[PDB]
Structure formats: C-alpha cells, structure tokens
Enzyme design. Structure first.
Site, PDB file in Angstrom:
ATOM      1  N   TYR B  54      17.535 -21.517  25.270  1.00  0.00           N
ATOM      2  CA  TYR B  54      16.773 -19.805  25.417  1.00  0.00           C
ATOM      3  C   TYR B  54      16.122 -19.534  26.901  1.00  0.00           C
ATOM      4  O   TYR B  54      16.122 -19.163  27.391  1.00  0.00           O
ATOM      5  CB  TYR B  54      16.130 -19.696  24.455  1.00  0.00           C
ATOM      6  CG  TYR B  54      16.736 -18.400  23.135  1.00  0.00           C
ATOM      7  CD1 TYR B  54      16.438 -17.257  23.403  1.00  0.00           C
ATOM      8  CD2 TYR B  54      17.691 -19.404  22.302  1.00  0.00           C
ATOM      9  CE1 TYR B  54      16.713 -16.403  22.499  1.00  0.00           C
ATOM     10  CE2 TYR B  54      18.384 -18.684  21.442  1.00  0.00           C
ATOM     11  CZ  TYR B  54      18.031 -17.199  21.472  1.00  0.00           C
ATOM     12  OH  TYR B  54      18.503 -15.818  20.469  1.00  0.00           O
ATOM     13  N   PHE B  74      10.668 -19.576  12.807  1.00  0.00           N
ATOM     14  CA  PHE B  74      11.602 -20.168  12.002  1.00  0.00           C
ATOM     15  C   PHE B  74      11.547 -20.962  10.513  1.00  0.00           C
ATOM     16  O   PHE B  74      12.385 -19.991  10.042  1.00  0.00           O
ATOM     17  CB  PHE B  74      12.360 -21.505  13.101  1.00  0.00           C
ATOM     18  CG  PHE B  74      13.488 -21.032  13.523  1.00  0.00           C
ATOM     19  CD1 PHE B  74      13.258 -21.266  14.938  1.00  0.00           C
ATOM     20  CD2 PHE B  74      15.048 -20.759  12.900  1.00  0.00           C
ATOM     21  CE1 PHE B  74      14.480 -20.847  15.566  1.00  0.00           C
ATOM     22  CE2 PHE B  74      15.857 -20.351  13.658  1.00  0.00           C
ATOM     23  CZ  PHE B  74      15.809 -20.918  15.183  1.00  0.00           C
ATOM     24  N   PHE B 140       8.763  -7.719  15.377  1.00  0.00           N
ATOM     25  CA  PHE B 140       9.603  -8.927  14.576  1.00  0.00           C
ATOM     26  C   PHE B 140       9.038  -9.010  13.481  1.00  0.00           C
ATOM     27  O   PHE B 140      10.311  -8.710  12.334  1.00  0.00           O
ATOM     28  CB  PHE B 140       9.862 -10.147  15.951  1.00  0.00           C
ATOM     29  CG  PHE B 140      10.658 -10.495  14.677  1.00  0.00           C
ATOM     30  CD1 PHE B 140      11.594 -11.135  14.837  1.00  0.00           C
ATOM     31  CD2 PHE B 140       9.291 -11.685  14.474  1.00  0.00           C
ATOM     32  CE1 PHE B 140      12.046 -12.268  13.857  1.00  0.00           C
ATOM     33  CE2 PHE B 140       9.250 -13.122  13.283  1.00  0.00           C
ATOM     34  CZ  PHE B 140      10.635 -13.413  13.725  1.00  0.00           C
ATOM     35  N   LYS B 168      14.430  -9.166  19.566  1.00  0.00           N
ATOM     36  CA  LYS B 168      14.722  -9.739  20.862  1.00  0.00           C
ATOM     37  C   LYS B 168      13.433  -9.165  22.327  1.00  0.00           C
ATOM     38  O   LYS B 168      13.035  -9.343  23.060  1.00  0.00           O
ATOM     39  CB  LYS B 168      16.118  -8.285  21.622  1.00  0.00           C
ATOM     40  CG  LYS B 168      15.833  -7.875  22.821  1.00  0.00           C
ATOM     41  CD  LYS B 168      17.121  -8.908  23.604  1.00  0.00           C
ATOM     42  CE  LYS B 168      17.712  -8.907  25.204  1.00  0.00           C
ATOM     43  NZ  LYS B 168      15.565  -8.842  25.572  1.00  0.00           N
ATOM     44  N   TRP B 295      23.561 -23.543  20.705  1.00  0.00           N
ATOM     45  CA  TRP B 295      22.735 -24.326  19.518  1.00  0.00           C
ATOM     46  C   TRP B 295      23.403 -23.708  17.988  1.00  0.00           C
ATOM     47  O   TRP B 295      23.754 -24.126  17.714  1.00  0.00           O
ATOM     48  CB  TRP B 295      21.419 -23.669  19.978  1.00  0.00           C
ATOM     49  CG  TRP B 295      20.421 -23.842  19.008  1.00  0.00           C
ATOM     50  CD1 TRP B 295      19.918 -25.469  18.430  1.00  0.00           C
ATOM     51  CD2 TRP B 295      19.729 -23.491  17.599  1.00  0.00           C
ATOM     52  NE1 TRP B 295      19.033 -25.439  17.315  1.00  0.00           N
ATOM     53  CE2 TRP B 295      19.613 -24.266  16.731  1.00  0.00           C
ATOM     54  CE3 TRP B 295      20.033 -22.553  17.056  1.00  0.00           C
ATOM     55  CZ2 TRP B 295      18.741 -23.902  15.243  1.00  0.00           C
ATOM     56  CZ3 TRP B 295      20.315 -21.774  16.171  1.00  0.00           C
ATOM     57  CH2 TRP B 295      18.951 -22.438  15.516  1.00  0.00           C
TER      58      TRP B 295
END
Ligand SMILES: C=C(C)[C@H]1CC[C@@]2(C)CCC[C@@H](C)[N@H+]2C1
Ligand SMILES: C=C(C)[C@H]1CC[C@@]2(C)CCC[C@@H](C)[N@H+]2C1
Ligand SMILES: [Mg+2]
Ligand SMILES: [Mg+2]
Ligand SMILES: [Mg+2]
Ligand SMILES: [Mg+2]
Ligand SMILES: [Mg+2]
Ligand SMILES: [Mg+2]
Lengths: 304, 304
Positions: B54, B74, B140, B168, B295
């Site tokens: 990323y 995650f 988020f 984002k 990925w």
C-alpha cells in the site's frame, strides 16, 4: 466499440429482401412521412431486416405480419420523442381499442387504419395466436410513457421496467405467432426465468448501440418524450464513469447473460423439462438476442 | 478469476521482510489469539505485506507504524463480525479516547494498550501528521457499525458509504504520514475527485476477492455484524447473475476507474494545478490500488 466474443450466431429469414420491399412499400404508400429525407431514412433503417433477424424461422406466409407490426411500432416510437408523457399516452391509448378491433379507425388518419387493418389481417390468419399478442403490446405501449422514466432508477429497477419498454413479451408472442409455435401455459411457466434473462440482453444491447442517437434526442426533442432513460446513463452515473466506459462494462454483462441463458437451458433439458416446443422456443430467443446485436451494430438508425 | 489487463505496476516497500517479522512478532506476543490455528492464520494473512504494498515509498523509519495500525484494525474488523451493531459501536467507541491519548488503557486488555502505545509512539515521531490520521480513523470505525448496512442499497449508494467503511481517508492520511508528505488544504481539496475515484477501486477490488469469506461469515457470524454488504452481492441481485459473473463485470469496471485515474491526473497537470507534493500523492494512490489488488489475489485471508 469492440464487442467481446459471443457464441451466439445470428440467422436471417431467407425471404428478407422480398418481404422488406413489400412492407417498406406499404408504409411508403400509406404512412404520413413529412418529406423525402425521412422516407430515405426510413428505408435506410431496415425495419424488416431486424424483424427477419429476430424471427429467422418464421413461417414464410407469416413473417410479413411481424415486419408490419414492428415497423409501425418503430415509427410510433420515434413520434413519441416529440410529445410529452401525456400526449404520448393519449396517442397510444387511442390505438389500443383499435388494435382490439373494438373501435373503427379514422380512414383519414394513417396510423389508425394501418393499425386496424394489420390486427384484422393477423386475426384472420390465426385468431388465437394473434389475440395473445394484444396485451403484451399494450403493456409495452403504456411503459413508453410511464412517468417512472423521469424518476431516479438503479440498474436493477431499470431492467425490471425496461423489460416492458423493450417489449420482451410482445416479441415473444410475435415470435410464436410467426412460427405457429404453440406452447401450453405450463410450458411457458417453465421458461419464465429464461425469458427474464433474455429481456436484459435485448435491452442493454439496444441501449449500448442506440445511446448516441438517444443522447442527441435528449438534447433536441421534447424534454419528456426524448428523456435519456437508459442503462448506459444509469451505470455511468452509479459508477461515476463516462458513457463509453459504461458501454464496455455493460457489454461484458451481456455476455454473462448469454452464459446464464445456456446454463438455464441446459438445466431445463437435464431435468427432462425441455419439450420439443420449448426447445424451438429457447432457440428462437437466442436468435432474437444474436439478431438484435447484428442489426444494432450495422443499422444506419444508430450509426447516423 | 482472470484479472483484466492493467497498466499499473505494483510496488512493495524494500523492508517488507524485516518489518513483517517485527510487527507479526509484536502481535503474536501481545494480541489474544483463541488458539494456535488462529496464530498461524494471522501470520498467513500477511498484514504487513499489504501495508508495504500500500505504501511502498514510505520512509524507512515510519513504515512500521503503518503496519502496526493496519494490523490491529484488521484484527478488530474480524472481531466486529461476531458483535451486534450496538456492541460493535461500543467496542470501537471505547478505543477512540484511547487513540487520542486522553484515556489510559487497561493493560490487562491487549487491544486497549496496543492502541494506546501505538498512537503515542506515532505522535512521538511526528505529532502533527499523526494527529491528522485520528479523525479519518474514527470516521472509518463509526462506518463499520452504520445502520445503513441493514438497509438495501444500490450500487451508487453503496460506493458512497463504502468510501468510509473501506477507510479511504485513513489510508490517505496514513500514506502521507508514512512518507512525511505534507499537503496544503488547497492541495487536498484539489484532488477530491481523484480520491473518490480511487476509493471505488479499492472497495470493489476488495469486494471481489473477499466475497467468499464474507458469504461464509454472513451464514455463521452475528446477524448484524456478519451481514453481507458488498458490491458483488448488489450487482448480482440487480443484474440477476451469479456472484462469479458479477466479479468479472466489476473487475472490468475497476479498469475503467484506473483509466479515469490517469485521465484526472493528466487533467490536473494540464491545468496549472499539479504541485510536486500532489504528484507524489496521486502516484501514491496508484500504489494503493495496484498493491491492494496484488495482495488480495494472493493472501490466504481470502483464498481460504
Ligand atoms: C429491442 C428492440 C428491437 C426494440 C426497438 C424499438 C421498438 C419500439 C421497435 C418495435 C418493437 C418495440 C418493442 N421496440 C423493440
Ligand atoms: C481495503 C482494505 C485494505 C481494507 C481491509 C480491511 C481493513 C479493516 C484493514 C485495516 C484498514 C481498514 C481501512 N480496512 C482496509
Ligand atoms: Mg422507445
Ligand atoms: Mg426509441
Ligand atoms: Mg434505444
Ligand atoms: Mg469491515
Ligand atoms: Mg471485513
Ligand atoms: Mg471485504
């Protein structure tokens, strides 16, 4: 615009040329064309050619009926673009009892006696099969001026509506009529999922090729009658991409519908539910899809 | 699933091997895994590998911060699948004052002190740029339990929402932090069309590859936290095709978003608006898109 590979191969009715001359000649004689430029553009479109590509296995003495019906609906479809929703609705609703034969036509008004004489000739050839086209036609006519065209739609909502506006049902009943292909209510219930899938293909393929024509119409004709209601615009708005980008994405989706058609047909046969009549029917639907695409990518109606 | 052609060249941070060992080792020491199987699965996912894909041009002494942040998010993202919207919100909201450093962590609770120590370490390295990640992160986190996930959405409405759920903004601020790339408010406002377009690419690419994982989750996890919310399911429903068919169509759309990215970037410099900082930024966004895809194709998180 490069169409992705397809396994559907188009077929055209062998009598396409002589029937085209017959049907084009009839309308050139009776229809109220404004001028010579319009008469040439009418012939250039090849309305009997798309009909012969749609129903390539129609009976030799019935294909002309289909050509006449689609031709007059093509002509009306263009007229409605310069009308409001209200004017277009009044125009179509006037033709509905005339199509049934319940109301006599005004012989000084071409569209009325053309519509009347057509359906009378079709009932004379095959009463039962002709009557089964009536309501599907009326469903299509009423979708043309539905005020839902002026309201927000997603892709799914459009395709559901567009099934009526693209005239999927009338094209199916016309195909059966032209082929003399009679199916039981039970048989037709078996292929409803196949019909629904086929409709999306006919709809989007038309949307893709007729976009430029309809873009121009939206800017020049009546703001209601010529409103830009298409999958190309809708997907472009949802994804925030150009109309050209939306076309390329939609064409891939069309190939997925071709795959689904083959999958659905294969399951119908495996379950032992594909009668000889149904087998002819589903093949006829494939001709519609491939024939629609061949004509759309070549007709001057969309390229100029 | 054969991906359509792309002109993007994915790049990976050169220190990926050392940083992965460091960051994985940290979480294996501190995070609370249910069993050895889960510890293997955690390493198998390669959370630091995607971070290095990323942000391949992150500064050498800052890349590990980004790896730690994305890794813990995650893990939290998976935990929320077994919670209700209310429980999930409560879980996230407790971490927010801790992230700010306003509230001390319960050192008996791994997620609390991992979050606290991380943000403290980030502010110690670069206080101003670390603070600018805070609100994009909270945005988020609060999107993860948005009640709109329990309402039917169209493609356009989903992508608008998903921009927050895909994180984002946080990825943008994290990228800038990791690269030490400072931008003016004028520069930031200037590339908002590019950001919105990039968000759709990240979202759908993730939706495509994580679909099978999320389908299973919807069947087994919490009725709210595990709810199936993805562009794959949406397009499949609206177009009436399989999820696999929807994946192929969405992938083509992603390539159109890649084309638009290049178009928007070229227009930025065609107009007198591309600064050196903006050039590094929009190029960094490309790495995010190509890195996210690379990925997602190979990670065991999605393939098993
Ligand atoms: C997809 C087709 C062939 C459309 C074209 C436009 C038209 C008005 C032509 C006449 C038939 C109706 C349903 N409709 C079909
Ligand atoms: C598209 C990506 C990389 C998502 C994956 C899931 C996750 C919760 C991982 C941590 C970062 C947030 C934004 N989000 C990114
Ligand atoms: Mg029309
Ligand atoms: Mg039209
Ligand atoms: Mg059209
Ligand atoms: Mg999530
Ligand atoms: Mg998730
Ligand atoms: Mg996902």
């Amino acid at each position: 615009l490069e169409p992705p590979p397809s396994t559907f191969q188009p077929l055209c009715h062998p009598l396409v040329e002589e029937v085209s001359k017959e049907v084009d000649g009839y309308f050139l004689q009776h229809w109220n064309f404004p001028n010579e430029k319009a008469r040439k553009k009418f012939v250039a479109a090849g309305f009997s050619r798309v009909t012969c590509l749609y129903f390539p296995k129609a009976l030799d003495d019935r294909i002309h009926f289909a050509c006449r019906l689609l031709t007059v609906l093509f002509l009306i479809d263009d007229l409605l673009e310069y009308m409001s929703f209200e004017e277009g609705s009044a125009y179509n609703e006037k033709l509905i009892p005339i199509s049934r034969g319940d109301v006599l036509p005004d012989r000084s008004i071409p569209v009325e006696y053309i519509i009347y004489d057509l359906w009378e000739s079709m009932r004379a050839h095959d009463r039962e099969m002709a009557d089964e086209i009536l309501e599907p036609v009326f469903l299509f006519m009423r979708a043309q001026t539905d005020r839902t065209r002026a309201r927000p739609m997603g892709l799914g909502g459009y395709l559901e509506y567009r099934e009526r506006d693209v005239g999927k049902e009338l094209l199916a009943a016309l195909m059966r009529f032209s082929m003399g292909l009679k199916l039981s209510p039970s048989e037709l219930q078996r292929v409803r999922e196949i019909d629904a899938n086929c409709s999306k293909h006919l709809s989007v393929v038309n949307d893709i090729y007729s976009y430029e024509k309809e873009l121009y119409t939206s800017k020049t004709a009546h703001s209601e009658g010529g409103i830009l209601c298409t999958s190309v615009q809708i997907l472009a708005q949802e994804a925030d991409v150009t109309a050209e980008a939306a076309k390329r994405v939609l064409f891939v989706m069309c190939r997925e519908w071709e795959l689904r058609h083959q999958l659905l047909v294969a399951r119908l046969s495996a379950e032992g539910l594909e009668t000889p009549g149904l087998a002819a029917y589903v093949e006829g639907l494939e001709y519609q899809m491939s024939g629609n695409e061949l004509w759309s990518q070549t007709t001057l109606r969309y390229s100029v």
